Amino acid sequence: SIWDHDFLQSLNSNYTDETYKRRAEELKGKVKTAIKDVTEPLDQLELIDNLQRLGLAYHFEPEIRNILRNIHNHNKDYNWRKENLYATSLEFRLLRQHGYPVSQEVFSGFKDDKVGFICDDFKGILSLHEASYYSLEGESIMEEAWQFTSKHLKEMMIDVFVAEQAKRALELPLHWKAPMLEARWFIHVYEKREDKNHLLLELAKLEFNTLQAIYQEELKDISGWWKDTGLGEKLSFARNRLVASFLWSMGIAFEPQFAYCRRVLTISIALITVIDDIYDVYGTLDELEIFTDAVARWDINYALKHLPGYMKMCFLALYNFVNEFAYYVLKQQDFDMLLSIKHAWLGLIQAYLVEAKWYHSKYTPKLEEYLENGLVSITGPLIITISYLSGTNPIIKKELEFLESNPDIVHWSSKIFRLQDDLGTSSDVPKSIQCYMHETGASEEVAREHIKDMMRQMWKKVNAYTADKDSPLTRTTAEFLLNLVRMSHFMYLHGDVGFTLLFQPIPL
């Protein structure tokens, strides 16, 4: 909580200057021409892998789409299949990431029916491990691939760069990282390479520092808004969690075009943090019932008349914020979404009340019963509603109605979110771990392992709903939902990398 309002206002990064923006386009063009001279399919796959891990993929989307669509037209050729675990795993991962259909049978050549997978090459095992997280439900080869690669990678810590790659893949696979999170670490790895493209490296450093400067200017505006509402002065527990909230919004939508999306997400997460503290710490059951009814009615006159003192400003801050949110969308694209966004906030508030009633009743629900309410209380359904309404123009009515129908992809992504957040609880109200221990008798350590395995199994379900080209949700909308879950995976590992992401530039 060191990055207060005064610190954010004092920042003055250089990379908002016009000379850097000019050198950026000068690099983009000279990088696009160099992409043309990458004709080898494996070199093309490694180019896409470098572009994505450097944080530059959104600057070359058509060029990446051309490479992958041509490799997909060729991968059915007779001599295309080669007995390389690294190359086969890299192609499998990239094509499945971008929605192209690839069968798990591309790995059967490396797997003996009786002994399993036969490999000792670390580069291929590491690539196969990352490809296993793109598995679908019931792909026994991919599940067996994960068991083989996971065991082998844990044995890597019974030269020095090998052990680090093994540790990073085990704590956070590529499929579970947001793009810009791994940008800084991979830029250093790419710099130390011999075959590195020097213009690609300079572009990655220049774009990273420009992104920080854009976020810092957004934080100045968001910091002023938070200071104006004065919630931190009225509630001594409303500690400034603004930079932490912006960190989540950055992971949900990092691109500069989503500035308003990040602003609404940051303020919403900050309000959720304050409201959550009221529902499971400071509020009494009667106070929480009134606050829930006030949210349900969405009536400022009723709320000012019936709410306790410390809840009046907390409600009116949320009330005005959401109504200004609806006004902005109405001014921007003439779409009325007040009923939708208000309905989503009430769903979270009612989920908070269910947990509050369970705590006072000293009731320990079954894990399945807890996750049904817990997937809403983790704000998954609300955050994707906020992300779509603040990050899409034009808003599609049928696409918004699909999110309101409680689709399966929101159902399982929110459960992973809830399970991952509950894993952040210390060994010292029952959560996922306690409900699972009470239900199976397993120890806390074993329960954590089984819960960690549940998330990986639920990601298989999400991988199916993401590849379905027939849902009303576009590919951009689904990335909001996945990046939210990916941020939960990232925050569980780092609970200051937030400071090194927003305020610490890459020395050019």
What does 330-378 look like in DSSP terms, one character per residue?
A: HHHHS---HHHHHHHHHHHHHHHHHHHHHHHTT----HHHHHHHHHHHT
Q: How far is the CB of 318 from Mn ion (least distance, A)?
A: 16
Binding mask 360-379 for ligand 0FV (x = CB under 6 A): -----------------xxx
Task: Rank residues 280 and 404 by Cβ distance to Mn ion and give the closer one.
Answer: 280
Single-letter code of the amino acid located at 316: L
Burial class (CB within 10 angstroms; exposed 0-12, middle 13-18, buried 19+) of 103: exposed
Report the half-sphere exposure of 164 (CA within 13 A, side-chain side).
Answer: 6
Q: What minimum distance in Å lies between the beta carbon of 223 and Mn ion?
A: 24
Dihedral (Cα; 380, 381, 383, 385), 10-degree rounding: 160
The SS3 assignment for 179 reads: coil
Name which of 318 and 400 has its Cβ closer to Mn ion.
318
The tokens for 189 are 């790895």
The least CB distance from residue 316 to ligand 0FV, in Å, is 21
Count of residues touching ligand 0FV (by CB under 6 A)? 11
Taking residue 236's Cβ as centre, other Cβ atoms within 10 Å add up to: 9
Answer yes or no whether residue 276 interacts with Mn ion by CB under 5 A. Answer: yes
Listed in sequence order, the residues at least 6 apart from 472 whose beta carbon sits closer than 8 Å to its beta carbon are 396, 398, 399, 401, 402
The 244-263 site mask, x for binding ligand 0FV (CB under 6 A), equals ----x---------------
Query: What is the C-alpha separation between 103 and 85, in angstroms, rounded?
Result: 15
- Does residue 269 belong to the site contacting ligand 0FV (CB under 6 A)? yes
Which listed option, Mn ion, ligand 0FV, none, makes contact with residue 326 (CB within 5 to 8 Å by class)?
Answer: none
DSSP 117: E
Confirm or reject binding of residue 143 to ligand 0FV (CB under 6 A).
no
Please identify, using beta-carbon distances, which residue of 145 and 484 lies nearer to ligand 0FV.
484
Q: Please tell me whether residue 111 adopts helix, strand or coil conformation.
A: strand
Q: Is 143 in the site for Mn ion (CB under 5 A)?
A: no
Determine the Cα–Cα distance for residues 277 and 274; give it in Å rounded to an integer: 5
Q: Per CB under 6 A, which region of 87-95, 227-235, 265-273, 284-292 contacts ligand 0FV?
A: 265-273
Q: Report in angstroms how near the CB of residue 302 gets to Mn ion at its nearest.
A: 25
Instruction: Examine residue 390 and tell whether it contacts ligand 0FV (CB under 6 A).
Output: no
- Ranked by CB distance to ligand 0FV, the top (closest) residue is 273
65 annotated ligand-binding residue: no
Contacting residue, 273, 350, 434, 471, with ligand 0FV by CB under 6 A = 273
Q: State the nearest-atom distance from the C-beta of 311 to ligand 0FV, in Å.
A: 18
Q: Using CB distances below 5 to 8 A depending on partner kind, what does residue 463 bind out of Mn ion, ligand 0FV, none? A: none
- Please give the residues from 405 up to 444 whose contact with ligand 0FV meets the rule CB under 6 A: 421
336 is in an annotated binding site: no
Residues 82 to 121: which contact ligand 0FV by CB under 6 A? none
For 154, phi then psi, to 5°, come to: -70, -30
* Count of CA atoms in the C-beta half-sphere (13 A) of 293: 14
Is there a binding annotation on residue 421? Answer: yes
Helix axes 380-391, 309-333, angle to 10 degrees: 40
CA 290, 294, 297, 301: dihedral to nearest 10 degrees? Answer: 120
* Residue 379 partner contact from Mn ion, ligand 0FV, none using kind-dependent CB cut-offs of 5 to 8 Å: ligand 0FV
Closest contact distance (angstroms) between CB of 269 and ligand 0FV is 5
Q: Which residues of this protein are in contact with ligand 0FV, per CB under 6 A? A: 248, 269, 272-273, 276, 280, 377-379, 383, 421
Binding site listing? 276, 280, 418, 421, 431
Binding site listing for Mn(2+)? 276, 280, 421
